[PDB]
């Protein structure tokens, strides 16, 4: 606290100046109080100087140590974060590939179902692949126009 020490020193100096002026104008308790204030100010100044040196040394040491530790920790954290991002991208690609492989292996078509579809579809153009059958060609899913729209679904089943 530089403010308190400066105030004490200024008060001691003012008391000393007043005592000197009184002694010069003349030819006790005031001088004793001024001397006690000056001694207390000197002791407080010495103690504050020692404490300030100690605090400066400790602040420099702690600043250097904390800067080194924080720089090391931040560098390690950034490196670990980049490595974890790379590993997470790799694991995400691997999980996507594994899900695709599972959907490819666990899912399959039935031979008997396809054989029955071919045996029952060889009558009309329902699920048969024509020669010029591109996406959006005249091939449709319905068996016929009159057999589906005007057939049993439209007449008997409405």
């Amino acid at each position: 606290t530089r403010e308190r020490l400066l105030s004490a020193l200024e008060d001691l100096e003012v008391l000393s100046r007043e005592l000197i002026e009184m002694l010069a104008i003349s030819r006790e308790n005031q001088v004793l109080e001024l001397l006690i204030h000056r001694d207390g100010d000197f002791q407080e100044l010495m103690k504050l100087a020692l404490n300030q040196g100690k605090v400066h040394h400790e602040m420099q040491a702690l600043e250097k140590e904390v800067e080194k530790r924080d720089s090391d920790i931040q560098q390690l954290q950034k490196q670990l974060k980049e490595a974890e991002q790379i590993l997470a991208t790799a694991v995400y690609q691997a999980k996507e590939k594994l899900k695709s492989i599972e959907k490819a292996r666990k899912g399959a078509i039935s031979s008997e179902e396809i054989i029955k579809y071919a045996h029952r579809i060889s009558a009309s153009n329902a699920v048969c692949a024509p020669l010029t059958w591109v996406p959006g060609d005249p091939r449709r899913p319905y068996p016929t126009d009159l057999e589906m729209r005007s057939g049993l679904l439209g007449q008997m089943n409405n």
Binding site: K68, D72, Q75, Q79, L80, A83, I86, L87
Partner: peptide, 19 residues
């Protein structure tokens, strides 16, 4: 997984950055 060894080098980089 071999790149993990590179991260292990970062651990060495953690040793050299401490001085």
């Amino acid at each position: 997984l071999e790149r993990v060894i590179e991260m292990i080098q970062n651990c060495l980089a953690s040793l050299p950055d401490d001085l």
